[PDB]
Design a binder for this molecule. Structure first.
Ligand SMILES: [Mg+2]
Ligand SMILES: [Mg+2]
Length: 415
């Protein structure tokens, strides 16, 4: 397996992200805490203000460690994954030879660096009762929802129009509607040129055959490993409703993040809050969607799962050893959809793979069930391309894979 992406290459996007973007995220977190000082006093009294100041102090220390490339330190505050994290940090140090020194922001794998930063943010918060419940990214995730109301209404209206007629659609029209919603989940004719890899036909073949072959009382389970909250989450819920309504799935299982993560990533609180806001909307079609979605969850047609593994630094190839219960759960899927760039990085180890490497190889043994990554590119990693394809893009458009402009549907599994 190739070397990890990291800040060792000062010309790398990982370097640029660690040097400039991560400090910016921490500053904004600190700003968010500062702006909530009055709310914390109203709800918690003086102990809330002392806790806000403590959290800010800790986050300021964290930002200084990053800005000065200090070595990583063990996590201290008791938490469900503290010991697993410290074991992983010990393991990561063991990979370093004498010349490499100690794990640190601009030397260690970029995946570990970013995951460590968010876990240290969470440590600062859980060290600061009574504000230890606070989600420093909640305001931004709520803002994405409120800012997207027109597109959310339009998409909920589209889905409900679709569902009204869904039993009159032939197989090929149903397929076309499936492909449309998959592209909405990714991001339509104007955007098609920016789909670099399109395995959507293999998803249709897989689920269509499951539907045609399904025996009585048998299940077709589709798992969705989520990325961002807000409009992205809505596109995934809309897809999942279509999957049930079209009978391409009989159950949909969702996996989010146990803690606030990578700013926007959906936690159980974001998931429940968004569905509540859609359900209690006064718009006819948004409200009907939200009601239907809460009913799917009640019946077990939709299931939300929390698992700590997704907010660990480990590459997904480690899941069988580190989270065998989760791996066995994923093996019950008929299809797993992984959303977004971080999932892609974890699927491929965040390594400097050649463009030509097959996705199957880059997964490094992680083959729980048929799976597809639905991803816009925000990292210097992309495998499974045709010879010369990524090279031509680099030469024509040096930023191509880091701007979120290009997308993929990249599949591993049968057919
Ligand atoms: Mg050493
Ligand atoms: Mg995200």
């Amino acid at each position: 397996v190739p070397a990890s992406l990291s800040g060792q290459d000062v010309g790398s996007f990982a370097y640029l992200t660690i040097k400039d973007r991560i400090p910016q995220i921490l500053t904004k977190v600190i700003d968010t805490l500062h702006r909530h000082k009055s709310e914390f006093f109203e709800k918690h009294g003086e102990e809330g203000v002392e806790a806000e100041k403590k959290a800010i102090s800790l986050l300021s220390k964290l930002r200084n460690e990053l800005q000065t490339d200090k070595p990583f330190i063990p996590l201290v505050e008791k938490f469900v994954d503290t010991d697993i994290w410290n074991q992983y940090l010990e393991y990561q140090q063991s990979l370093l030879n004498e010349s490499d020194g100690k794990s640190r922001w601009f030397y260690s794998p970029w995946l570990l660096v970013e995951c460590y930063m968010y876990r240290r943010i969470h440590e600062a918060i859980i060290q600061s009762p009574p504000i230890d419940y606070f989600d420093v990214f909640k305001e931004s995730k709520e803002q994405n929802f409120y800012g997207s109301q027109e597109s959310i209404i339009a998409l909920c209206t589209h889905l409900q129009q679709l569902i009204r007629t869904i039993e009159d659609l032939d197989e090929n029209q149903l397929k076309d509607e499936f492909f449309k919603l998959l592209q909405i989940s990714l991001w339509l004719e104007d955007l098609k040129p920016f789909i670099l890899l399109n395995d959507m036909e293999h998803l249709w073949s897989l689920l269509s055959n499951c539907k045609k072959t399904r025996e009585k009382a048998s299940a077709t389970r589709v798992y969705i490993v989520l990325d961002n909250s807000g409009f992205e989450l809505v596109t995934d819920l809309i897809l999942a409703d279509f999957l049930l309504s079209s009978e391409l799935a009989t159950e949909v299982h969702f996996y989010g993040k146990t803690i606030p993560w990578f700013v926007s990533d959906t936690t159980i609180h974001d998931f429940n809050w968004l569905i509540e806001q859609v359900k209690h909307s006064n718009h006819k079609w948004m409200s009907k969607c939200g009601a239907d979605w809460e009913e799917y969850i009640k019946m077990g047609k939709w299931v939300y799962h929390n698992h700590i593994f997704w907010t660990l630094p480990h590459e997904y190839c480690a899941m069988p050893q580190v989270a065998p219960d989760l791996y066995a759960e994923l093996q019950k899927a008929h299809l797993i959809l992984f959303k977004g760039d971080l999932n892609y990085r974890k699927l491929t180890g965040d390594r400097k793979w050649e463009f030509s490497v097959p996705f199957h190889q880059a997964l490094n043994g992680f083959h729980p069930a048929p799976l597809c990554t639905i991803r816009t590119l925000k990292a210097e990693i992309q495998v499974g391309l045709q010879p010369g394809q990524g090279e031509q893009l680099l030469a024509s458009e040096p930023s191509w894979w880091t701007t979120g402009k290009y997308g993929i549907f990249q599949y591993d599994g049968p057919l």
